[PDB]
């Protein structure tokens, strides 16, 4: 299982952001909006391959969550699709980024702005977000935003679509790494 792949909660489907860990404990990161109110995660629609359970959730205000892996056999690739990730960095305006989601696959573009505030309504406001010209569609939540071998962010949301084009915002991955003490591999 890698970044960009589907993940299933009792409520719907998201995307695995990045495979991370602390010591010998592995977790995965995804969107806070996916982890809020979800307990267990499964690797498939049938809900048979159990992945693990929610250890943390930060949404709204931020948009990151973490899931402690409980499946011992599932391979936990430290990649985004075939793509290896070695470190993490902070987005910069003009940075070329790539997103991978479980509905859309891989789409490229660049960072158009930093620290954007996005209001999803009903007090769901998030802040400190990476703005990009990359499209994303339902199902893509929590996917990875990378730049070559660097982890940059987690798909939070936005507007438009992949056919007509759109705007997507990403939550910096470093904030999430630091909140939980985990590191990418």
């Amino acid at each position: 299982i890698s970044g960009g792949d589907a993940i299933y909660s009792s409520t719907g489907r998201c995307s695995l952001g990045f495979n991370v860990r602390s010591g010998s404990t592995y977790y995965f990161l995804t969107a806070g909006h996916c982890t809020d109110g979800a307990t267990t995660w499964w690797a498939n629609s049938a809900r048979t391959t159990v992945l693990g359970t929610t250890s943390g959730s930060s949404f709204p205000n931020n948009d990151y969550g973490i899931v402690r892996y409980t499946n011992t056999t599932i391979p936990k690739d430290g990649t985004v699709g075939g793509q290896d990730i070695t470190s993490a960095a902070n987005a910069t305006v003009g940075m070329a980024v790539t997103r991978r989601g479980s509905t859309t696959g891989t789409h490229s573009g660049s960072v158009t702005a930093l620290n954007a505030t996005v209001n999803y309504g009903g007090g769901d406001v998030v802040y400190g977000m990476i703005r990009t010209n990359v499209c994303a569609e339902p199902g893509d939540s929590g996917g990875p935003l990378y730049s070559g071998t660097r982890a940059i962010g987690l798909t939070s949301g936005g507007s438009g679509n992949c056919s007509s084009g759109g705007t997507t915002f990403f939550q910096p991955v470093t904030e999430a790494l630091s909140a939980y003490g985990v590191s990418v591999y």
Partner: protein
Amino acid sequence: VDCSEYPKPACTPEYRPLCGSDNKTYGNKCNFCNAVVESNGTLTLSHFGKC
């Protein structure tokens, strides 16, 4: 589903599908409600789930 609070400028892309009167599956309520607005109220809900 109530689309009064729409349109909404941005939507989280969590996948919880709905079926619209246009036989198109909308990924979630937010995508669904913004389309209903976009159609000037023309679009409705056929049922929950994929079409």
